[PDB]
Amino acid sequence: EDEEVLYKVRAKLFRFDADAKEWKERGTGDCKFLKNKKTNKVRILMRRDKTLKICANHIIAPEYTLKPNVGSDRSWVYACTADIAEGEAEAFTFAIRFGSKENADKFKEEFEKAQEINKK
Amino acid sequence: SMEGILDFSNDLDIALLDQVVSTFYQGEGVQQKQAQEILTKFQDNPDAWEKVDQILQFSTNPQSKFIALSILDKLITRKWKLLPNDHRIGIRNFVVGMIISMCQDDEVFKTQKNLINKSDLTLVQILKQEWPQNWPEFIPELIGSSSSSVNVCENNMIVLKLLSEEVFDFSAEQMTQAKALHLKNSMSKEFEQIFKLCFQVLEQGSSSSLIVATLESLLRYLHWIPYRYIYETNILELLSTKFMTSPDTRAITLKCLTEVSNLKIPQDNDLIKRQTVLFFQNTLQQIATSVMPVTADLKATYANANGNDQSFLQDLAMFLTTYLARNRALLESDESLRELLLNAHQYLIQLSKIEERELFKTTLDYWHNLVADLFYEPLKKHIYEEICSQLRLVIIENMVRPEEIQLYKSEREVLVYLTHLNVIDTEEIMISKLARQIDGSEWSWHNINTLSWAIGSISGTMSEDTEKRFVVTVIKDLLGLCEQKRGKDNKAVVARDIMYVVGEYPRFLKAHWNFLRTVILKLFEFMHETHEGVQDMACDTFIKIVQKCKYHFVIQQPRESEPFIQTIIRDIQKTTADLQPQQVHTFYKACGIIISEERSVAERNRLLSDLMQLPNMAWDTIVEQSTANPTLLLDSETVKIIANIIKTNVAVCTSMGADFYPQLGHIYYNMLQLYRAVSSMISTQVAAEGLIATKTPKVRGLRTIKKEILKLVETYISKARNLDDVVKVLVEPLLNAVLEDYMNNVPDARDAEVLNCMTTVVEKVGHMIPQGVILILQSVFECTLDMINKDFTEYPEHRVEFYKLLKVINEKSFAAFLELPPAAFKLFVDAICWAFKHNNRDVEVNGLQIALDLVKNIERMGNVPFANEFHKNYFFIFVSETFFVLTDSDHKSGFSKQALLLMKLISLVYDNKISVPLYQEAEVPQGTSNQVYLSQYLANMLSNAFPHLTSEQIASFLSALTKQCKDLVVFKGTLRDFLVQIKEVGGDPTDYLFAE
Amino acid sequence: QVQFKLVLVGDGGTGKTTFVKRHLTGEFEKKYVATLGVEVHPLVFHTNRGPIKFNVWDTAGLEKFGGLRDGYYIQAQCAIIMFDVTSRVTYKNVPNWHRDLVRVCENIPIVLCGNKVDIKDRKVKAKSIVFHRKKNLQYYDISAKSNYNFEKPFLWLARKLIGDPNLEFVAMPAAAPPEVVMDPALAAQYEHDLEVAQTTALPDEDDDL
Numbered sequence A: 001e002d003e004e005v006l007y008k009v010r011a012k013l014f015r016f017d018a019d020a021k022e023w024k025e026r027g028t029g030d031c032k033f034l035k036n037k038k039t040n041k042v043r044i045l046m047r048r049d050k051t052l053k054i055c056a057n058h059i060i061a062p063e064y065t066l067k068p069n070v071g072s073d074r075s076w077v078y079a080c081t082a083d084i085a086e087g088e089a090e091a092f093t094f095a096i097r098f099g100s101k102e103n104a105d106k107f108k109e110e111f112e113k114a115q116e117i118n119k120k
Numbered sequence B: 001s002m003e004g005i006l007d008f009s010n011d012l013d014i015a016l017l018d019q020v021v022s023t024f025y026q027g028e029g030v031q032q033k034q035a036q037e038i039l040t041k042f043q044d045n046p047d048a049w050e051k052v053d054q055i056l057q058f059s060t061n062p063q064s065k066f067i068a069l070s071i072l073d074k075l076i077t078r079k080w081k082l083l084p085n086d087h088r089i090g091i092r093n094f095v096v097g098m099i100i101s102m103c104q105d106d107e108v109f110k111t112q113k114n115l116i117n118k119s120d121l122t123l124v125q126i127l128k129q130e131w132p133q134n135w136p137e138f139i140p141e142l143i144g145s146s147s148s149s150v151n152v153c154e155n156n157m158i159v160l161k162l163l164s165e166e167v168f169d170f171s172a173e174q175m176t177q178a179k180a181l182h183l184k185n186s187m188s189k190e191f192e193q194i195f196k197l198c199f200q201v202l203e204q205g206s207s208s209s210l211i212v213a214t215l216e217s218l219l220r221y222l223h224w225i226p227y228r229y230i231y232e233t234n235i236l237e238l239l240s241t242k243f244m245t246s247p248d249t250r251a252i253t254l255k256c257l258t259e260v261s262n263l264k265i266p267q268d269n270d271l272i273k274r275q276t277v278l279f280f281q282n283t284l285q286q287i288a289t290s291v292m293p294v295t296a297d298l299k300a301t302y303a304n305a306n307g308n309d310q311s312f313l314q315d316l317a318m319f320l321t322t323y324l325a326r327n328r329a330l331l332e333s334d335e336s337l338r339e340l341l342l343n344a345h346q347y348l349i350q351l352s353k354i355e356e357r358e359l360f361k362t363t364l365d366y367w368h369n370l371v372a373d374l375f376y377e378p379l380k381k382h383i384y385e386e387i388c389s390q391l392r393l394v395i396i397e398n399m400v401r402p403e404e405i406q407l408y409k410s411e412r413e414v415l416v417y418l419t420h421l422n423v424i425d426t427e428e429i430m431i432s433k434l435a436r437q438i439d440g441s442e443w444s445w446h447n448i449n450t451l452s453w454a455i456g457s458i459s460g461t462m463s464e465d466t467e468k469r470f471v472v473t474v475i476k477d478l479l480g481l482c483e484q485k486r487g488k489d490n491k492a493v494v495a496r497d498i499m500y501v502v503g504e505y506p507r508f509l510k511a512h513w514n515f516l517r518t519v520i521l522k523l524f525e526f527m528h529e530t531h532e533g534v535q536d537m538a539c540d541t542f543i544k545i546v547q548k549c550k551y552h553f554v555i556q557q558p559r560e561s562e563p564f565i566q567t568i569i570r571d572i573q574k575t576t577a578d579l580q581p582q583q584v585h586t587f588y589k590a591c592g593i594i595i596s597e598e599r600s601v602a603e604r605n606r607l608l609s610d611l612m613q614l615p616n617m618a619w620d621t622i623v624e625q626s627t628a629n630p631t632l633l634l635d636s637e638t639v640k641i642i643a644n645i646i647k648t649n650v651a652v653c654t655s656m657g658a659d660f661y662p663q664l665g666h667i668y669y670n671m672l673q674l675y676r677a678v679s680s681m682i683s684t685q686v687a688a689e690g691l692i693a694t695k696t697p698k699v700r701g702l703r704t705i706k707k708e709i710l711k712l713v714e715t716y717i718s719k720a721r722n723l724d725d726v727v728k729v730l731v732e733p734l735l736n737a738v739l740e741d742y743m744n745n746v747p748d749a750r751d752a753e754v755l756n757c758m759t760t761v762v763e764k765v766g767h768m769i770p771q772g773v774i775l776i777l778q779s780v781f782e783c784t785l786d787m788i789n790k791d792f793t794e795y796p797e798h799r800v801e802f803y804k805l806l807k808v809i810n811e812k813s814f815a816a817f818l819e820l821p822p823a824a825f826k827l828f829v830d831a832i833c834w835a836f837k838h839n840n841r842d843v844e845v846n847g848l849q850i851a852l853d854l855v856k857n858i859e860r861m862g863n864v865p866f867a868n869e870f871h872k873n874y875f876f877i878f879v880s881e882t883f884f885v886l887t888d889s890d891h892k893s894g895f896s897k898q899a900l901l902l903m904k905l906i907s908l909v910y911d912n913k914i915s916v917p918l919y920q921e922a923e924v925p926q927g928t929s930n931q932v933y934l935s936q937y938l939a940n941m942l943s944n945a946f947p948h949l950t951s952e953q954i955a956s957f958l959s960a961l962t963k964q965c966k967d968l969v970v971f972k973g974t975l976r977d978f979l980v981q982i983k984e985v986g987g988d989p990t991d992y993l994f995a996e
Numbered sequence C: 001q002v003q004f005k006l007v008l009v010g011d012g013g014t015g016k017t018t019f020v021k022r023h024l025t026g027e028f029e030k031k032y033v034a035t036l037g038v039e040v041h042p043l044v045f046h047t048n049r050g051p052i053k054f055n056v057w058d059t060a061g062l063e064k065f066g067g068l069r070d071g072y073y074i075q076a077q078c079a080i081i082m083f084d085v086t087s088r089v090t091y092k093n094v095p096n097w098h099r100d101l102v103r104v105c106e107n108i109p110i111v112l113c114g115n116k117v118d119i120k121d122r123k124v125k126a127k128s129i130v131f132h133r134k135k136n137l138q139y140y141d142i143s144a145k146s147n148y149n150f151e152k153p154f155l156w157l158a159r160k161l162i163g164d165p166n167l168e169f170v171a172m173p174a175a176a177p178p179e180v181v182m183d184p185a186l187a188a189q190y191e192h193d194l195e196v197a198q199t200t201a202l203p204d205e206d207d208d209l
């Protein structure tokens, strides 16, 4: 790999479907923060258990903000402007849920550290 | 333009249909989808059948012709009898002609198998309608046409196979009993001629595709034909020699010989016994010489998955296990058949090593049958010693974890039987497998785990003395293995396997107090290891050991100052300090199991007091602060502490049941005050924030407190011994705390667990609280019905708990329904019928049981005005609602209970056990019996619901039904006959006279 | 890239569409919307032998929505037969689905799948499931909801169709994702869409994830 793993955590990812006004699960597996050894840019790369299919692939943009979901104390929702998991870069409203509040808070800490690395 | 074919006013353009069909089968995305919809509407047009002979003649697309035959099949199976005789003979002759024509063209026969097979099935649908009564010559003409061509002969074998399947294999659900019997007797009467042809083809041989089609039809025949066609002809010899040698015929021949092994055969005939031996000997000889020797590595062959190897090896396992399970006694007492017997078993040993779970299970079912036999049958085990030795290694190397329930059970049972048959061989294999873990040659997590599960599985099979030496040897070896291993991953794996093994040997632990004590203290040390899996395994091992050895924790052991339970309780804070909440609850549950062994009341109550010390002190300080200032609950962290206190009480109440009462009594009053305070907080959070509040972590936390309180009370009441205290102390405060709160919350804030708690209360003490049951119904009945009577989907837990509560009230306190005002009683009848329409099998089954029980409850009242008014108002509602769910094809899972309910309703009238006329006066002569009026009402109801039935069909059906209303199996037969006849036109009314 | 027609058959409500959708998008559809005739979707897996494409014909199990019925099976190269381990009738009907399927598709690899093994009250016990043995079907316990063995039917069919018993699903390398600039004109657009999404609860808040 041309990338260093900064953080790895088990997570479930959702995307908001505005039409059906509901959260639709996109995958479950290891969410990884990967630092490109050439550009030093940190991305989220998430693969599904067993199929290993990509369900998240985007830069941790400095302009993104993690917000609580009304339902959860172990989730974050954020707008992503360019995710290439399904191919052509698309904008999503994402929600990512972890096994515990501690995992979610640790994720937030790591996501901010990555935002600062990406500011350089 | 594709939609052109849906316009029936204009003649059909075959080239357009061919394009739509091509677009559907070969097109993509939106175009495929649109072609799909158009083709469905085309096929479903009730006049589309008139287009079939046009499409069959003038279409170039074989997919169009396939879809044309589907349309024809709907006409033949549903509406055939509406056609004039001339038209039916016309279709019949066209279909036969189209089949013969396709078969006589070598190019079409080779490449259009789909369309020919579909044509053959269409012909078989015609035979089901026409044959033999309106087509006596069909079989003679098929036999005749078979010598004219090898293609026609082969295709005639496909027709006869499909006919045999339709008549003998799939008739049960698809035909009336009378029509199934008719076609079975018809095929039976003409089979002599069919068999003669099949035998000639198999003898005369030559074309492999023809031979394979003939053996495919034979496989179907073997489900029903008499043994003499197999044993009194050359056919057994051909199957077990010639057809085993060529690989084209081998797979089908093996499946035939498996069904031959299942024929009904005379038991007292030496010639037949010798023929049964011979075909087996011949089959195994052809395998050994033409396929693979007994030594072959079938694991390797199967894995390589060349050609049809996997299917062949599956079929061989099915043949060997089927034949040997029936016939191995034939091979056991004759010295000249010993080699055949052991070679057959050696093939099974090789098949058992294949890495394929479902194949392994098939061979394991056989091994279970064999070793069970050797355990009980005199003078047999010695025959199989070398087979059994190899099988011990196969089972030990394939042992799965006990979480795989059925497979672990099957494996354990086989290994236990094998251990009894030779304990020394079992021990040596297990110790030598352990040695190969210790020397690293076979070391892996999977391998030490599988071995530990195997060693665990045979606990209780050795003598106590042999077990003692074996267990010490195994623990010493696993301890050495642990020391020897490096890094916490490896050590954790071996530590979990030591805990596993020790937990499976309670007899050993019970005999060796010093060992047991050390194990527990070691488990307590492991409860501080954060290394994943270790705390969970320590807690699981602790409760498993306690369940089996509890008596040893409650007595004073020699050279101890106190019962060990006192030592566990004294140090409980320290022991459990690093556990997650669910692990603490297991730990407290285990302590509850021990304490319940103490049968001295004073000493039990004191141990229970000491165990509950930490949660009771956390509780007391919260109740002081919580009541002193209510706003302290809103705090997320206190809600988590309160829920965990209640859950600890649930855990200890689960293991102590009746003995838990003094602890419940200590918290009961303040627990129900806390229920009220948390209810207020939920209510006012929903008011302030909206229905979304119920999704918030805070409100879910509060609701968790309410659900654990209801769980604690239902857990105690379900095991309570003193029901007087339940009624006098518990019930009144419970109803006051929960019923109005449930009623006066918005649907989305109502806990389905309230219904579950009330079900247990009515179940256990319903007879003793008639006024409490009335209050339960008044609080939950109408508001819960209104949540679930708009659709079948909303509030699924309320739905299930609602009908469980009505069921128990209707069983235990039916007087509560007598107290309902007429309008509420009408809603109860509506609720029952509503349950009948459900597809969810929980609700439907409770629905039908309530209806049964309610009818029984009304019958019990005898000849009084409430019973009479019930029948006048509801008898016909239950009869028509039950018939609705019987006949609409959407409620097949409820068939048995629908039938039982309908039988009860019809038998009430047939016995004259309803005092008043069911008809309102001047609707019939005033003398008229309820039997005559029920006849009339059902005839009218069925005629309007099924207008295509004749008056004769309905009258015969109802005549059969009323005569059979004391015989459930025959009654159900008549109901299933009716469900077949309503799917077609011109069902024979004489079918309802069927008798076996 | 090699594409194979896969036909999915079994009683209504057994989980055919749910199982496929989970494989296409990753989502779990809780609602029962009965299939009308057939839904066709391409489904691609990446293997150590390159990509394999299944053209998935997800057929209707309900008789009244059956459409072309066995017409859908024409030129299938593989099949899944689905039942629900919580509904005995759905297993009783497995021989009827198998009959209708193999009359059209005589020599294809077929997986039998008992779905919904996540539900505690199982009605079709392991001991009862033997139909696959004489018919040479592969069998898996699955759950579309928990993802228990969710990949196994496709992995087994891929091994059979490619003729490689050691075929594995692999991870495809993930392209470096674009760095983009948030459009100042749609910044108001996004705060709205995020408001709606923060105030709609995530489903299944009691699950391990």
Ligand SMILES: O=C(O)c1ccc(N2CCN(c3cccc(C(F)(F)F)c3)CC2)c(NC(=O)c2ccc(F)cc2)c1
Binding pocket: B472, B475, B476, B479, B495, B498, B499, B502, B514, B515, B518, B519, B520, B522, B523
């Ligand atoms: O006769 C006795 O009084 C006696 C007392 C304790 C014994 N032990 C059995 C318990 N034990 C043990 C060690 C580590 C883990 C566990 C586990 F918790 F069960 F996992 C148990 C090792 C010590 C054993 N059994 C042994 O095999 C043993 C004991 C001490 C040794 F140094 C070596 C062997 C015997």
Ligand SMILES: Nc1nc2c(ncn2[C@@H]2O[C@H](COP(=O)(O)OP(=O)(O)OP(=O)(O)O)[C@@H](O)[C@H]2O)c(=O)[nH]1
Binding pocket: C010, C011, C012, C013, C014, C015, C016, C017, C018, C019, C028, C029, C030, C031, C032, C033, C034, C035, C036, C059, C060, C061, C062, C115, C116, C117, C118, C119, C142, C143, C144, C145, C146
């Ligand atoms: N608990 C549970 N529910 C499931 C599972 N798979 C599917 N379901 C539910 O089952 C219901 C029916 O699913 P569908 O996929 O629509 O069923 P289907 O077989 O396609 O139905 P037809 O199209 O009518 O043949 C839905 O409510 C699903 O959410 C599962 O693994 N577990």
Ligand SMILES: [Cl-]
Binding pocket: B324, B325, B326, B327, B328, B329, B330
């Ligand atoms: Cl026998």
Ligand SMILES: [Cl-]
Binding pocket: B078, B948, B982, B983, B984, B985
């Ligand atoms: Cl009809």
Ligand SMILES: [Mg+2]
Binding pocket: C016, C017, C018, C033, C034, C035, C058, C059, C060, C061
């Ligand atoms: Mg569907």
